[PDB]
Amino acid sequence: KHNMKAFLDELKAENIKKFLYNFTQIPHLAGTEQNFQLAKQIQSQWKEFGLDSVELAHYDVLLSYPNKTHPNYISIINEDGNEIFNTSLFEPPPPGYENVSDIVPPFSAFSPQGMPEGDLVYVNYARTEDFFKLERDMKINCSGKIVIARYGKVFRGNKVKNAQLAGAKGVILYSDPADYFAPGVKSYPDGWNLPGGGVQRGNILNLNGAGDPLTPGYPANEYAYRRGIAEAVGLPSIPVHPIGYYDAQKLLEKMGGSAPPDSSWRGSLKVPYNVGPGFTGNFSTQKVKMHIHSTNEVTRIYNVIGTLRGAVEPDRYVILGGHRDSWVFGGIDPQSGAAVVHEIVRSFGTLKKEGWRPRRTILFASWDAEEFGLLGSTEWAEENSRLLQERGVAYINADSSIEGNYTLRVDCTPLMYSLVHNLTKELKSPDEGFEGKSLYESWTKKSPSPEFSGMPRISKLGSGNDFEVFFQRLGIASGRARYTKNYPLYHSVYETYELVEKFYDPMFKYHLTVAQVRGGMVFELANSIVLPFDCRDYAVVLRKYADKIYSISMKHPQEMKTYSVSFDSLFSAVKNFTEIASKFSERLQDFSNPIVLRMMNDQLMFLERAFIDPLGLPDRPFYRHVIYAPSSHNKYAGESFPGIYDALFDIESKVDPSKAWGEVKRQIYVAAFTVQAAAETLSEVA
Amino acid sequence: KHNMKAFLDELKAENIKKFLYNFTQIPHLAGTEQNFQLAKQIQSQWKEFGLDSVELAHYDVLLSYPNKTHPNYISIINEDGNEIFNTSLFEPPPPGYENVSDIVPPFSAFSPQGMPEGDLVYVNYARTEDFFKLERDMKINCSGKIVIARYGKVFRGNKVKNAQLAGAKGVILYSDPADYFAPGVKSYPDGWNLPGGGVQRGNILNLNGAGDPLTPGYPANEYAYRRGIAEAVGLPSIPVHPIGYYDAQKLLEKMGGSAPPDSSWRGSLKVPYNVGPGFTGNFSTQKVKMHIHSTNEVTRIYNVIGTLRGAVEPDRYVILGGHRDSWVFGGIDPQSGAAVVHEIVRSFGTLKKEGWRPRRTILFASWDAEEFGLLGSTEWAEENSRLLQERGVAYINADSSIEGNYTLRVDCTPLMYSLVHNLTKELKSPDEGFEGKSLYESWTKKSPSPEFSGMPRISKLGSGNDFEVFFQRLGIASGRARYTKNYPLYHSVYETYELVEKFYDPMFKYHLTVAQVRGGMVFELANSIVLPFDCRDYAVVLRKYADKIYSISMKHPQEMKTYSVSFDSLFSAVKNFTEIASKFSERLQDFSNPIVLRMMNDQLMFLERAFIDPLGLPDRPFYRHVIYAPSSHNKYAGESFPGIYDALFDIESKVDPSKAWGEVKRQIYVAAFTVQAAAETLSEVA
Ligand SMILES: *[C@@H]1O[C@H](CO)[C@@H](O[C@@H]2O[C@H](CO)[C@@H](O[C@@H]3O[C@H](CO)[C@@H](O)[C@H](O[C@H]4O[C@H](CO)[C@@H](O)[C@H](O)[C@@H]4O)[C@@H]3O)[C@H](O)[C@H]2NC(C)=O)[C@H](O)[C@H]1NC(C)=O
Ligand SMILES: *[C@@H]1O[C@H](CO)[C@@H](O[C@@H]2O[C@H](CO)[C@@H](O[C@@H]3O[C@H](CO)[C@@H](O)[C@H](O[C@H]4O[C@H](CO)[C@@H](O)[C@H](O)[C@@H]4O)[C@@H]3O)[C@H](O)[C@H]2NC(C)=O)[C@H](O)[C@H]1NC(C)=O
Ligand SMILES: *[C@@H]1O[C@H](CO)[C@@H](O[C@@H]2O[C@H](CO)[C@@H](O)[C@H](O)[C@H]2NC(C)=O)[C@H](O)[C@H]1NC(C)=O
Ligand SMILES: *[C@@H]1O[C@H](CO)[C@@H](O[C@@H]2O[C@H](CO)[C@@H](O)[C@H](O)[C@H]2NC(C)=O)[C@H](O)[C@H]1NC(C)=O
Ligand SMILES: *[C@@H]1O[C@H](CO)[C@@H](O[C@@H]2O[C@H](CO)[C@@H](O)[C@H](O)[C@H]2NC(C)=O)[C@H](O)[C@H]1NC(C)=O
Ligand SMILES: *[C@@H]1O[C@H](CO)[C@@H](O[C@@H]2O[C@H](CO)[C@@H](O)[C@H](O)[C@H]2NC(C)=O)[C@H](O)[C@H]1NC(C)=O
Ligand SMILES: *[C@@H]1O[C@H](CO)[C@@H](O[C@@H]2O[C@H](CO)[C@@H](O)[C@H](O)[C@H]2NC(C)=O)[C@H](O)[C@H]1NC(C)=O
Ligand SMILES: *[C@@H]1O[C@H](CO)[C@@H](O[C@@H]2O[C@H](CO)[C@@H](O)[C@H](O)[C@H]2NC(C)=O)[C@H](O)[C@H]1NC(C)=O
Ligand SMILES: O=C(O)CC[C@H](NP(=O)(O)OC[C@@H](NC(=O)c1ccccc1)C(=O)O)C(=O)O
Ligand SMILES: O=C(O)CC[C@H](NP(=O)(O)OC[C@@H](NC(=O)c1ccccc1)C(=O)O)C(=O)O
Ligand SMILES: *[C@@H]1O[C@H](CO)[C@@H](O)[C@H](O)[C@H]1NC(C)=O
Ligand SMILES: *[C@@H]1O[C@H](CO)[C@@H](O)[C@H](O)[C@H]1NC(C)=O
Ligand SMILES: *[C@@H]1O[C@H](CO)[C@@H](O)[C@H](O)[C@H]1NC(C)=O
Ligand SMILES: *[C@@H]1O[C@H](CO)[C@@H](O)[C@H](O)[C@H]1NC(C)=O
Ligand SMILES: *[C@@H]1O[C@H](CO)[C@@H](O)[C@H](O)[C@H]1NC(C)=O
Ligand SMILES: *[C@@H]1O[C@H](CO)[C@@H](O)[C@H](O)[C@H]1NC(C)=O
Ligand SMILES: [Ca+2]
Ligand SMILES: [Ca+2]
Ligand SMILES: [Cl-]
Ligand SMILES: [Cl-]
Ligand SMILES: [Zn+2]
Ligand SMILES: [Zn+2]
Ligand SMILES: [Zn+2]
Ligand SMILES: [Zn+2]
């Protein structure tokens, strides 16, 4: 028969391996010819595999590249203007790739041009709290200084936003061995650690969901009206560049001024980690000079969109999407995920060739320019927003399949928790010591839930990947899964096929397990008669998030008294959601009537949709989900009740407490209303 | 059988008459006890009539009332400060009502308080072009002057906005016999004309769709966070008051300064209609002084919401709504419409008692506080926006059933044109000389289409009534119909039951015809297996609107050359919409499969929805429909392609033509994209 087991059994580790090798022999940088050719290859293969239609959707978006004849670098310059030390012009290429063309040298995408010269200040991870510590506690002024920050902890775009607001005139990002060199493992090529010459590429935008910087709200098609550069969304105002730890050592070793405030500011290099500003006595007249000559350029990008039409509900879409563009070879990010998507399409197509079709339409996407700000997925979702609004059942992301080899990682809407628990109980664990056990068993043992005995940890969605437009802008139930650790070579030339094959997943069994999870989720979402969402799981978390935000507010009891700040309405809404969801579940379990079913399937599908506020969150119009947004301090992390959270954040420092607490009360009202409105979508319809 | 004819035949003119009498014996001002009692009466009766559920939905919104012990009036004041002439404190009540309590005296709702004293400037209708003529051509400066404007031509809130932007310190509105006294007809009580002591009440807000001034975006429920008054939406900054033409004569007769520029500035009073500023030589030291003491007050309002649950698609809503609050007796506005709604509910309920139910759910609404800015309908739609978004088939308004006795007036989305043509061909004409003919025949003869021989005129929707939130904010297909002229007593104490019974519709046959049209539209929308919308009619008008906006732009050929302004993308989108709609129509006609049907019904229902832009129009976030918005110069009138229209308006006067024409190009792109996106909702779904 054609059931989920047939689909799952058709997936093969050796196919995922062959596809990964095929996708990682040359760089596939967004906007390059190589990446367009790979798009055409994937289009051809998805057609071969049996999809009903496979098209390219192209857009012309703002990208950023170094100038090939005017390289980016950083110097220490003496008082005479002699550059006495220069950072590297490229990463030493790995064995057998020393003759590979078109490896983009390390750079921070979308940096403006400039040659700022000045004194260094070391800012730890450049987090909001690191700048609070510098200004407020240490009285160190970053204004007109060049800041040097270690990568880690938060999205690099937030570091740059923080540095710019502190008054910095430039930012140097570096990888500290504390964060990118695991003890007892060798550097690439002899292990999976970052060598001293390795460097992390990546964009430094603050788009807040906008997509292409020049066309927020609308797809960057052939007749698009573009903003001028000065009005573009999210671009940094100061030059930025990344370096490795051999080069960082040379910039940090001379640092003087103030000592690091505590051990959490010290990395692993043999330097004092002095904050500065500037260098110790003998070197006080030396400065650091950046030379950044990259250019932003409107460039064509190509998504591949594959359709497998539903037999019964072709106007309901379950979407499996992940990106295809890479910084260099993309051995993990994204090709470990793209290879898994490729094998999932192959398996679905095998069933289709035998006469099967899923109940609902499945869309498969190979997104372009994810690395430059989620551009491909976001432009396509802007172009198709009305179709997605009214027809989108779910989005399953499919970027990197592995970031470790220890256990499963799942981040998803509460609506998918039950689906994920049930599916993983039917899959085999690939882990050593768990042979013959379920993936649910191994995952729950290795990654226990912090609140529930005998359950595994599932995280909320943050951002920094292609589900952002679907989840936080459009309110379509979204999820992701991969294998994880209890990674060093991220965005470096060393992230190759060999890295994966030798050190992460030699048998491709973790890749196969991830294909089973992502593919099984898609299968159930596209084929189950009743959509596999449990609204009651949203009720449970909403109470947890309400308790959490109330607890933050209760750090300020006097102000809550003074300004009459009550969470009563939010708890009332959550209580109402809990009751209504319980009754809806009874009806769903207790209802031959396809209209009641589809009416009920529409209530399930539109439930995530009901958490959207069309006015957006404050100053972030494309983050419209009221329960979840990317943290304003770290795009990778999710924040719950973000509008109330941001209203409360650092509120003791606000000069007008009446106004600040009034805005907290406004956000409580918006959240209580949105939770009650979403509950009411589950009430009897008439 | 139970079919449309059974529903139509059950409607009775004598019932509409009895209900109108019942609703108009005392005032029903929004926020008063009288209007709450009438709400409870309607709730009880709709239950009696057979509705499944009938509830009150209440909100606490900003209303405005005169101060009962400190009356509003206007004076001419001499140099010593003696008030030598005072405007009336109330309208002389009509025969038999001279002892009726609680008649609100004439005032402009939401006027701020003040006692401004100054020189008059007469500004004709206070339209945008009237102020252009004053400032630009006549060099008359309104700054610090009191402006006197005649009612007519545009919504009174636009007049006040225009006066405020001209620098006026107050506005006097008056009814000129030119506009409110039809030749050869007697003043009330002996005819339907406005007497010299009659005065038009009405609000002077500029809400642009916001609803309650204090809670834009969210319902004004018990825990709502309110804006402070200074941040409220739409309130006027200068005092305003309305007067009748006996009082206007006394203010205008002394006017000096400049002569009226031409005859279009002259009304019918025996005065020169001099523009001013100020009075002629002998009276130059006299001034005009306003005394306004009204107060804005958060007040509870009550909508009645009646549900008749659908038998097959209970999660699809067809809404018949109209308001219940009146300025005084509401003999025409709104009770002539409310009485018709009441009889429609009675007739549907008669069928329901016999075992019938409509295919889809019908919701019936008696809205409160329409006269204070569409507040009741808009707060309820804000509270229920997700349900309405995803389930709203159509909204049929039901305010005044008559404004004349000549022929039918219909304003509606193009999606309802075919429905209206077909329905009116099956209804009897009530007109003298057309006995035995169809309403379609009489209407088409009396009100021919300007573009099509043998068709009647149907207008686009403007605003100034309760369909605004449903149509321009939420994108639900909307329509309205009433009897019209080829009205003088509007919002005056003289607008009574006797006015209607004696002068407008003694037999109640025009009311019955309107009940047949509104009720028949609701019946077909709620019962037809395929929704009665023809997408091809949208294609035809979109081409007409594109031709229109291109023609406006082509008044500036040099600028279009200089800034490369092309409408090619918009015409391409319209061409695509035309083709795709034609193919969709073929499929609809050519498709036993209830999923294909409902998939197709969803494509029909979401087609109006697809013209919504979630970012709204510039500076008007609640006007989200890209094809239709209320004119920025006159809330009552609809404007097509409003974003392009406003970008082009008076563009020759803009100081930075590059920026202005760039914004025209941006709006062309938004419109072309939205039309193409709406077309694509009608494509095959997969
Ligand atoms: C969760 O669901 C419950 C329903 O089970 C829902 O309860 C509703 O609460 C509101 C607000 O508390 C109630 O509102 C009251 O309605 C009555 C008329 O029915 C009014 O008379 C009340 O107003 C008086 O009292 C107020 C409070 O002291 C005064 O401010 C006011 O001036 C009046 O004197 C009041 O508006 C409503 O009746 C219930 N609905 C029910 C029980 O069906 C609750 O709102 C939901 N939670 C959320 C967050 O939506
Ligand atoms: C109305 O529907 C039609 C479909 O019938 C749709 O036609 C589309 O028009 C676009 C834009 O004109 C076409 O875009 C082209 O696509 C090809 C690849 O297929 C590209 O190579 C083209 O780019 C080249 O040429 C450009 C113009 O000179 C250059 O600016 C560019 O740099 C490249 O050299 C171009 O992007 C598209 O192929 C068709 N789609 C079809 C025919 O299926 C039209 O867009 C719809 N109208 C609206 C308003 O949407
Ligand atoms: C990746 O695999 C693809 C698909 O097999 C290879 O592309 C094919 O290459 C052969 C030999 O050059 C051609 O005859 C086919 O037309 C190609 N098919 C396509 C593009 O669909 C490609 O060579 C492989 N790439 C690498 C680096 O191994
Ligand atoms: C670091 O790089 C710079 C730039 O290439 C070197 O400085 C240049 O040296 C050349 C040849 O000696 C001169 O003609 C240029 O005028 C110099 N340019 C600048 C901007 O100074 C520099 O020598 C390098 N430093 C080290 C230590 O290798
Ligand atoms: C996950 O699996 C559980 C266990 O089978 C499902 O819960 C059962 O669902 C059936 C059918 O509705 C009910 O009859 C049982 O009473 C349920 N058992 C329980 C709650 O213990 C559950 O629906 C599945 N989740 C999905 C499909 O999302
Ligand atoms: C309007 O009609 C209503 C409905 O018939 C009248 O209200 C009823 O009045 C009688 C006699 O006072 C009561 O016994 C009923 O309880 C009322 N029914 C309701 C409110 O549903 C009302 O009197 C009429 N108003 C006027 C001005 O004629
Ligand atoms: C217009 O109305 C005003 C206010 O009632 C009248 O002026 C008042 O007259 C009384 C009694 O003569 C005085 O005690 C008040 O001081 C006056 N108030 C003001 C504000 O002037 C006025 O007489 C009326 N004018 C006409 C022509 O009837
Ligand atoms: C209005 O009435 C016309 C005339 O009956 C309807 O058009 C017919 O619809 C039927 C059924 O789909 C077709 O078989 C005919 O070919 C149509 N005749 C035409 C176009 O002349 C039309 O659908 C009705 N409009 C509605 C229901 O909105
Ligand atoms: O521009 C954006 O929003 C993100 C672009 C780009 N996304 P990516 O490198 O493909 O993926 C981020 C990557 N990050 C993580 O998984 C992660 C992030 C923080 C901590 C632990 C793991 C992922 O989600 O797979 C980036 O982070 O540079
Ligand atoms: O605040 C608002 O938007 C409108 C409130 C209020 N609406 P209304 O008096 O009930 O109805 C306006 C009324 N106006 C017209 O029909 C009309 C308006 C201009 C020209 C000819 C007819 C109608 O739509 O029935 C008003 O116009 O004062
Ligand atoms: C890159 O640098 C070269 C060499 O100095 C210069 O001529 C060219 O303009 C630059 N290219 C850009 C800015 O795209
Ligand atoms: C930091 O430095 C500059 C002076 O160059 C000054 O303008 C700015 O206000 C300083 N900030 C603080 C907090 O001292
Ligand atoms: C794979 O798992 C083994 C065993 O726990 C571990 O020693 C190794 O470090 C893992 N590899 C990676 C890349 O995490
Ligand atoms: C109305 O006017 C009276 C009498 O002058 C005054 O005492 C009262 O405050 C006013 N009421 C208001 C402003 O609501
Ligand atoms: C109108 O009058 C005031 C002077 O009282 C002045 O400030 C304003 O600029 C004037 N406007 C014009 C156009 O003359
Ligand atoms: C009713 O119609 C007649 C005949 O045309 C006309 O004389 C009269 O003025 C109409 N009444 C109103 C209120 O328009
Ligand atoms: Ca865009
Ligand atoms: Ca509101
Ligand atoms: Cl992922
Ligand atoms: Cl109406
Ligand atoms: Zn990635
Ligand atoms: Zn990446
Ligand atoms: Zn009205
Ligand atoms: Zn009115």
DSSP code string of A229-278: GGG-SS--SS-EEEE-HHHHHHHHTTB-BBPPSSGGG--SSSS----BSS
Contact criterion met (CB < 8 Å) for B386 and A668? no
What kind of fold does domain B1-66+293-532 have according to CATH? Answer: Aminopeptidase (3.40.630)
Q: Do domains B67-292 and B533-686 have the same CATH topology?
A: no
**Residue B121 near residue B171 (C-beta atoms within 8 A):** no
Can you read off the two tokens belonging to residue A545?
């998030």
Strands, DSSP E only, in B555-685? 628-631, 634-640
Residue A582, strand partner residues? none
Whole-angstrom Cα distance, residue A469 to residue A474? 6
- Work out the minimum CA distance from B238 to partner chain A, whole angstroms: 27
Contact at 8 Å (CB) between B97 and B124? no
Task: Collect all residues with Cβ–Cβ distance below 8 Å to B288 and sequence separation of at least 6.
Answer: B74, B75, B76, B77, B117, B118, B119, B120, B146, B172, B251
Residue A602 to residue A681: CA distance in whole angstroms:
10
- DSSP, residue by residue, B274-303: --BSSB-GGGTT-EEEEEB--EEEEEEEEE
**CATH code of the region B67-292:** 3.50.30.30
Tokens of A83: 């550059």
* Token code pair at residue B5: 């004819």
Instruction: Please state the φ and ψ torsions of residue A515, each to the nearest 5 degrees.
Output: -65, -40
Q: Are the beta carbons of A594 and B599 separated by less than 8 Å? A: no
| Paired tokens of A590 | 């207790």
**Residue A185 near residue A191 (C-beta atoms within 8 A):** yes
> What DSSP assignment string belongs to A136-174?
IIT----TTPEEEEE-BSB-HHHHHHHHHHTT-SEEEEE
Q: What is the SS3 assignment for B360?
A: strand
Best residue among A63, A70, A294 to mutate for probing ligand 11, ranked by most atoms within 8 Å of CB: A70
Could you tell me how many CB contacts below 8 A there are between chain A and chain B? Answer: 122
Query: What ligand is nearest to the CA atom of residue B203?
Result: 10
B677·A385 Cβ contact <8 A: yes
Nearest to A642 by CA among A653, A631, A651: A631
Count of alpha carbons within 13 angstroms of residue B63, beta-carbon side: 22
Task: Show Cβ contacts of residue B355 under 8 Å, excluding neighbours closer than 6 positions.
Answer: B2
A61 in helix, strand or coil?
Answer: strand
Exposed e or buried b for every residue in A341-361, given b needs 16+ CB within 10 A? bbbbbbbbbbbbeeebbbbbb
For residues A102 and B197, what is the distance between their CA atoms, to the nearest angstrom? 86
Residues lining ligand 15, Cβ inside 6 A = B 141, 143-144
Catalytic residue of the set A268, A418, A438, A566: A566
Q: What tokens does B542 get?
A: 């979109």
Cite the annotated binding site of A by residue number: 156, 203, 215, 218, 323, 333, 370-371, 379, 382, 399, 463-465, 480-482, 490-491, 635-636
For residue B537, give every residue at least 6 positions away whose Cβ sits within 8 Å of its Cβ, in sequence order, or none: B414, B415, B417, B418
Closest CA to B154 of B193, B105, B113, B202: B202
Please indicate whether residue B191, judged by its CB atom, sits closer than 6 Å to ligand 16. no
CB A131 within 8 A of CB A156: no
Residues of B within 8 A of A677 (CB-CB) are 383-386
> Which chain B residue has its CA at the smallest distance from A606's CA?
B390
* Cβ(A577)–Cβ(A539) below 8 Å: yes
| CA gap A645, B563 in Å, rounded | 46
| Distance in angstroms (rounded) separating the CA atoms of residues B525 and B567 | 36
Secondary structure in 3-state letters for B366-390: EECCHHHCCHHHHHHHHHCHHHHHH
Q: How far is the CA of A339 from the centre of ligand 19 (A)?
A: 13
Under an 8 A CB cutoff, do A391 and B685 touch? yes
Domain boundaries, chain B: 1-66+293-532, 67-292, 533-686
**Known catalytic residue at A556:** no
Q: Please give the annotated binding residues of A for substrate, written as ranges.
A: 156, 203, 370, 463-465, 480-482, 490-491, 635-636
CA distance A564 to chain B (A): 12
What are residue B539's phi and psi, to 5 degrees?
Answer: -60, -45
CB A147 within 8 A of CB A126: yes
Is there a catalytic annotation at residue A70? Answer: no
Backbone dihedral region for residue B178 (phi beyond 0: left; psi -120 to 50: alpha; all else: beta): alpha
The token pair at A199 is 């460097």
Q: Which residues of A touch B606 (CB under 8 A)?
A: 386, 390
- HSE on the CB side for B298, CA within 13 Å? 17
> Which residues touch B639 (CB under 8 Å, ≥6 apart)?
B628, B629, B630, B631, B632, B645, B646
Q: Find out whether B511 is annotated in a ligand binding site.
A: no
Helix and strand tally (H, E) in chain B? 21, 19
Cα separation, A163 vs A290, whole angstroms: 16
- CB neighbour list of residue A381: distance below 8 Å, 6 or more residues apart: A211, A388, A469, A470, A473, A474
Nearest CA among B611, B646, B644, B618 for reference residue B631: B646
Asked if A627 and A539 count as a contact pair (C-beta separation under 8 A), the reply is no
Residue B390, CA distances (Å) to A9, B223, B320, B609, B674 in order: 39, 26, 18, 9, 19
Ligand 2 atom 23, closest CA? A222
Say which residues have a Cβ less than 8 Å from residue A470's Cβ, sequence separation at least 6: A319, A377, A381, A388, A392, A395, A476, A478
Cβ contact B254:B280 at 8 Å: yes
Q: How far apart are the first and last CA of chain B?
A: 40
Terminal Cα distance for chain A, rounded? 40
Task: Give the ligand with the smallest distance to the CA of B82.
Answer: 7
- Other Cβ atoms less than 10 A from the Cβ of A425: the count is 12
Describe the strand order of the beta sheet including A240-243 as a list of residue ranges: A120-122, A146-150, A170-174, A240-243
Nearest CA in chain B to A666: B225
CA distances from B204 to A480, A648, B210, B583 (A): 53, 38, 14, 47
| Secondary structure (3-state) at A584 | helix
Which position has the token pair 């070197």?
Answer: A283
Distance, in Å, from the CA atom of A114 to the CA atom of A236, rounded to the nearest integer, reads 12
Q: Ligand 5 within 6 A of A415 CB?
A: no
Looking at the DSSP assignment, which residues form a beta bridge with residue A484?
Answer: A407
Is any ligand 10 atom within 6 A of the Cβ of residue B371? yes
**SS3 annotation, B122-164:** ECCCCCHHHHHHHHHHCCCCCCCCEEEEECECECHHHHHHHHH
Distance between CA atoms of B534 and B412, rounded to whole angstroms? 13
User: Buried b vs exposed e over B373-385: b needs ≥16 C-beta within 10 Å?
Assistant: bbbbbbbbbbbbb
Instruction: Report the half-sphere exposure of A33 (CA within 13 A, side-chain side).
Output: 2
Pairing of strands B53-65, B295-308: antiparallel
Most informative mutation of A405, A502, A504 for ligand 13 (most atoms within 8 A of CB): A405
Closest ligand 14 atom, CA of B68? 1
| Contacts with A666 from chain B: Cβ below 8 Å | 225
Q: Report chain B residues whose CB lies below 8 A from the CB of A362.
A: none
Residue A615 and residue B217: Cβ atoms within 8 Å? yes
Ligand 8 binding pocket includes B422 (Cβ within 6 Å) = yes
User: Rounded to an integer, what is the distance from CA A149 to the centroid of its chain?
Assistant: 21
Q: Are A113 and A236 in contact (CB under 8 A)?
A: no
How far is residue B239's CA from residue B110's CA, in Å, rounded to a whole number?
Answer: 9
Q: Are A276 and A283 in contact (CB under 8 A)?
A: no
Are A202 and A371 a contacting pair, CB within 8 Å?
yes
> What letter would DSSP give residue A198?
-
CB B108 within 8 A of CB B173: yes
Please give the positions of B annotated as active site: 370, 566, 602, 625
Integer Cα distance of A265 and A130 in angstroms: 9
CB count within 10 Å of CB A216 equals 21
Q: Is B678 in the pocket of ligand 2 (CB under 6 A)?
A: no
Minimum CA–CA partner of B569 in chain A: A223
**How many Å lie between the centroid of ligand 7 and the Cα of residue B70?**
13
Task: Please name the residue whose Cα sits nearest to atom 22 of ligand 6.
Answer: B22
| Catalytic residue from among A212, A370, A498, A537 | A370
Entry field: residues in chain B: 686
- CATH code, residues A533-686: 1.20.930.40
